[PDB]
Design an enzyme around this catalytic site. Structure first.
Site, short mmCIF file in Angstrom:
data_model
loop_
_atom_site.label_atom_id
_atom_site.label_comp_id
_atom_site.label_asym_id
_atom_site.label_seq_id
_atom_site.Cartn_x
_atom_site.Cartn_y
_atom_site.Cartn_z
N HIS A 197 0.81 -1.21 0.00
CA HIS A 197 0.00 0.00 0.00
C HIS A 197 0.84 1.25 0.00
O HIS A 197 0.26 2.34 0.12
CB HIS A 197 -0.96 0.02 1.19
CG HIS A 197 -0.30 0.11 2.53
ND1 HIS A 197 -0.36 -0.91 3.45
CD2 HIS A 197 0.42 1.10 3.11
CE1 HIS A 197 0.30 -0.56 4.54
NE2 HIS A 197 0.78 0.66 4.35
N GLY B 194 3.67 5.70 9.53
CA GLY B 194 5.02 5.55 9.04
C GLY B 194 5.81 4.43 9.69
O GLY B 194 7.00 4.27 9.37
N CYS C 152 4.77 1.40 9.33
CA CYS C 152 4.56 0.31 8.39
C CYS C 152 5.88 -0.07 7.73
O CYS C 152 6.68 0.80 7.39
CB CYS C 152 3.51 0.68 7.34
SG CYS C 152 2.03 1.35 8.15
#
EC number: 3.4.19.12
Lengths: 305, 305
Positions: free
Chosen positions: B41, B143, B145
């Site tokens: 994503h 952030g 991720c």
């Protein structure tokens, strides 16, 4: 979101952990530049620990009595010096993994990461607090001596703790990297008493702020209290007195949550008098005091190194 | 002695964390050999996350749409491929810090260390468990991720988790390093339900054994129970059913403490029915289930890597 007991990345310290053997005992050392730091009782046998004369013992040791081993390569000891309770072993090689570092003596109530090592090899990392009685509640097994505590700020490793002994009560005691013991402890195997352990009030408040940030708000109330009237209640429950300096460092958290420090104090007062009544705050049923106001700000903002 | 929520030394993973930016969003990636793994994503804008067509989106992206940055040096993307929910970015440089590694898909109830990163820079390390509903209770900010979970065995880093999203309830969901989600979750911003979270019974028992090893024995009793009669009580209190496989892995701990597994079960049964009554076990007022029987054996023996 979420909140975890978090430790600093340990990679920069892993590269500095070496194995130190003098005679028959073996423990960990901190290899920085061309010097190896280790607890000085490495030069003791089991019988010596009862009443060791560290001067007379060290004098009978020669440079080649110390076997420093980094992973598999072996270092050459060309110098030995005793600074307080740590041994400094000048070696012939500078650690090519020496980070930007400095030695700091922390104050009670501050937190730091511990890298538990055995035979100069890293085993695990965990976060703890220097208790008000200058002990730590850690996880150490025989041969974990030499393990160091540390903080990382941007790119600079601040070494603040080296582990030396376990006390008969199960708590742990050690020194700064200059060899001065935290607390009234000495490095001999004798019954030693640590003072009354109190709760780090300023850290509890920071943790309560983290809880509000993460959605746990049931403990709040719209009463306030006085700094004076609150300390009266802290003393009864073995809580460190709160000072204006403690209020100031909590300013940023107060600003982010709209809750004045004294309002949060009035909430904590209630919790001590009435308890949690079976509920939890951030997954815990007890009041947690091993997060400093800075730790909370770090985790809830996203600071890196 | 002592017992701490301990994480693995993170040094070997720190050397593999890179920053990935595609268009406007930026998150962390895992750089192993000449490949960068990241959540897919990353190629989404905020509007795309509601109902993204990841195929159509990825097709409009070209190799030079991805800005991989390792510390300060920048990598050249010469290949991009989507494997399930992770992006694989073939780069022109092999990571000279690639450890001996392997991708593993762990089972619910197992523990692993998480290295929280922001902008490809490590922030902190903590230990957690894969819940029975295939979520984790971690500490992640926007952030984070790309952050990965991992275990270290001797000298081999087993990567087992990559963080993808936070759910509206505050829990976290992610994939293995092959891009398959733990649990029934998808990578789009939509209301997603996690199953009922149960307590990891086998881990609680291992923790109770750690307590006996560390001197906390008040909870013991000389009753026994049946595996059957105990599970009846576990179900009522949302406890995972205990099986013979769970008894077997507890064998070593039973042998070290002289307490049969079923005896400890009879002790845990009492604790659920009657609670702790204000006491603690290993400093905790709740039953802890994020230590596997292996974690306990590791900490109480002194295993290194």
């Amino acid at each position: 979101s979420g909140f975890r007991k978090m430790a600093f990345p340990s990679g920069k310290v892993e590269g500095c952990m070496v194995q130190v053997t003098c005679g028959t005992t073996t423990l960990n050392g901190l290899w920085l530049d061309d010097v190896v730091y280790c607890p000085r009782h490495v030069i003791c046998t089991s019988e010596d620990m009862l009443n060791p004369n560290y001067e007379d013992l060290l004098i009978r040791k020669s440079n080649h009595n110390f076997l420093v081993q980094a992973g598999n390569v072996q270092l050459r000891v060309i110098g030995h010096s005793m600074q307080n309770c740590v041994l400094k072993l000048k070696v012939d090689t500078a650690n090519p993994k020496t980070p930007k570092y400095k030695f700091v003596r922390i104050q009670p109530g501050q937190t730091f990461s511990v890298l538990a090592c055995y035979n100069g090899s890293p085993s695990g990392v965990y976060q703890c607090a220097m208790r008000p009685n200058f002990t730590i509640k850690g996880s150490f097994l025989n041969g974990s001596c030499g393990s160091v505590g540390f903080n990382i700020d941007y790119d600079c490793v601040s070494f603040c703790y080296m582990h030396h002994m376990e006390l008969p009560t199960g708590v742990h005691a050690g020194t700064d990297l200059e060899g001065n013991f935290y607390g009234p402890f000495v490095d001999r195997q004798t019954a030693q008493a640590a003072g009354t352990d109190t709760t780090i009030t300023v850290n509890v408040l920071a943790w309560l702020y983290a809880a509000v940030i993460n959605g746990d708000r049931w403990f709040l109330n719209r009463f306030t209290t006085t700094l004076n009237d609150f300390n009266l209640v802290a003393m009864k429950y073995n809580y460190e007195p709160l000072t204006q300096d403690h209020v100031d460092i909590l300013g940023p958290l107060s600003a982010q949550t709209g809750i004045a420090v004294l309002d949060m104090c009035a909430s904590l007062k209630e919790l001590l008098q009435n308890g949690m009544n079976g509920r939890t705050i951030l997954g815990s049923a007890l009041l947690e005091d091993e997060f400093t106001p800075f730790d909370v700000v770090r985790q809830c903002s996203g600071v890196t190194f």
